[PDB]
Design a protein around this ligand. Structure first.
Ligand code: HNI
Ligand code: HNI
Ligand code: HNI
Ligand code: HNI
Lengths: 141, 146, 141, 146
């Protein structure tokens, strides 16, 4: 259950990113890559090297899609349904792995958004991410 | 792997009662049944849709024959488990690209089938000293990841 | 998303237990106790000894409440709402810990119900347990 | 704990830049904020309802002062971490009854606050060699459980 406390919270928190979604996604991957080493097994064709237009290109993807979940947060399940599928029928990302980036996508916000990343936004940014990473696997069985 | 000189004469002597052929292949066919996030790797196995069709694609029953081969091949290598699956860990890593967690899903099923085959034989103090062999055969197999 | 495949599945699978819910609960605890040793930290007053009228008495509890979820599976969220509350306001059981028994409550079925515990019931008994252990924490934030 | 002689001059030399007092107590107050399943143990701490009231609790800001004391007290005991937290693991086990996972929630926050205090200082190749110190300070602290 997400209160409008978190919904408007992140609307202002994540709102500060905007044009930063390209870097703040691109680099939120490389954190997941360098910390947890069971998340680059999914990117074999990619590059796990600094500034690889793969991840760096991919940063405009997992992030730019996160914009629309925040926007269409009022109805995420129908906000990006083609996305909640183009996993579990195309590429499945394994539930517990979503967490391994559901907690590194906090850091690019916890560092790149200090004054904004507050103790309540932490809980409002997590709750949003604790659902975006469950709305996709809504069709896993 | 952390294991007692007591409960091992209980985690190893019931295993000789197992069938690495149908059981081993029963565990993995059951894997793609319940926890179907492991099917991305066995695409080229014909059809694994229906559960009667996964407990049987016949490549599925043949892969579970050798995947236990080693598991069986290291149930008496309990003090260097990390070393015996070694070569077998740096392969699931850049050839198949097998996520180390997958090795854990399958390790649980293999104890959920073992109880299946064994029934009451499977005592509480005995699943305990097997979980340790599986939640530990997984580590060894995920340890070679860079 | 639970199909009626699993709903009627377990209605027949779990159905075979019935009068066994007292033992098959009682002993599904002691499996979670003896395997994972971070689940008896919740039972400090209890006994983690064989046949302790605590667990044994508790076996008629987590199991006898599972009867009604299967029954009121048509509407679990409203099937045992006082239960979904009683955790995260009274005693919280910690999400990941629910799993540590969401996978040992399979074994008392996988052993005590062989002929019934099939490769499809495994997936239908898990999915039911993969939700009963999420319906309770529906109010965790 | 598995750690490089390279990235440690990067996991240990930024820490001296930390404040075990407010930061350490910032991490734990933030713990009961976001991940509130850890509040069962700090009942007798007055009121930890509101987030300004959890990050501003005196006993909460005082517990996070010493909980890092040891974390700080073992950031140079990186080759026997399992031994230095030892006595401290068989206590969270019988007295407080602190679930070993709780030690992991808090280990992540402490890296989500560290990036908070440090901003860009926190490079990608640097969170990586700290996660290892936290996802490993947790083990040591959960290792004494029977
Ligand atoms: C580590 C597993 C993993 C997780 C947790 C994850 C979590 C997410 C989340 C969660 C908050 C979102 C919004 C998201 C969005 C996306 N992912 Ni994810 N993805 C993951 C692994 C992938 C992989 C693998 C690809 C394909 C990359 C490629 O180039 O093939 C991917 C591709 C995408 C794409 C690309 C669209 C396309 O190429 O057609 C989007 C958008 N994603 N992923
Ligand atoms: C979900 C995926 C998955 C899991 C859980 C898994 C779990 C295990 C476990 C369990 C703890 C063991 C002992 C094991 C052993 C093996 N696996 Ni696994 N493997 C898995 C996916 C594979 C794939 C994919 C291959 C390559 C198969 C092929 O034939 O191409 C593989 C190949 C092997 C081989 C073959 C060596 C070779 O080809 O040179 C062995 C041995 N394994 N696998
Ligand atoms: C190890 C953690 C843990 C888990 C995973 C867990 C999982 C579950 C599940 C999951 C499938 C269900 C249906 C369930 C149901 C219940 N638990 Ni759980 N409980 C757990 C720890 C407890 C504790 C602790 C109590 C209180 C016992 C007591 O006597 O105080 C408890 C009490 C209950 C009660 C008692 C009602 C009352 O006394 O008013 C029910 C019902 N439960 N628990
Ligand atoms: C979510 C709960 C939780 C977490 C994550 C946690 C994580 C940690 C970590 C992190 C890896 C360390 C090094 C640590 C160290 C300690 N904890 Ni923790 N503790 C936690 C809950 C407690 C509780 C509860 C107590 C008793 C506190 C009190 O003052 O009553 C405690 C007490 C301690 C003590 C005090 C010893 C004594 O009272 O005799 C130390 C030292 N700790 N705790």
């Amino acid at each position: 259950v997400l209160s409008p406390a978190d919904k408007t919270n992140v609307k202002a928190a994540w709102g500060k990113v905007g044009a930063h979604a390209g870097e703040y996604g691109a680099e939120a991957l490389e954190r997941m890559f360098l910390s947890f080493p069971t998340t680059k097994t999914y990117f074999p064709h990619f590059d796990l090297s600094h500034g690889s237009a793969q991840v760096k290109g991919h940063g405009k993807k997992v992030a730019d899609a996160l914009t629309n979940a925040v926007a269409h947060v009022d109805d995420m399940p129908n906000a990006l349904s083609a996305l909640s599928d183009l996993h579990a029928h195309k590429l499945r990302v394994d539930p517990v792995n979503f967490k391994l980036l559901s907690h590194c996508l906090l850091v690019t916000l916890a560092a790149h958004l200090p004054a904004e990343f507050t103790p309540a936004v932490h809980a409002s940014l997590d709750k949003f991410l604790a659902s975006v990473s469950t709305v996709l696997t809504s069709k896993y069985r | 792997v952390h294991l007692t000189p007591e409960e091992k004469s209980a985690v190893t002597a019931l295993w000789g009662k197992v069938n690495v052929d149908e059981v081993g292949g029963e565990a993995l066919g059951r894997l793609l049944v319940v926890y179907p996030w492991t099917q991305r790797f066995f695409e080229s196995f014909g059809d694994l849709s229906t559960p009667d069709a996964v407990m049987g694609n016949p490549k599925v029953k043949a892969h579970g024959k050798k995947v236990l081969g080693a598991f069986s091949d290291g149930l008496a290598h309990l003090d260097n488990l990390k070393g015996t699956f070694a070569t077998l860990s740096e392969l699931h890593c850049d050839k198949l690209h097998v996520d180390p967690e997958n090795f854990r899903l399958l390790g649980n099923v293999l104890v959920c089938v073992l109880a299946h085959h064994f029934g009451k034989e499977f005592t509480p103090p005995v699943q305990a000293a097997y979980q340790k062999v599986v939640a530990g055969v997984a580590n060894a197999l995920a340890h070679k990841y860079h």
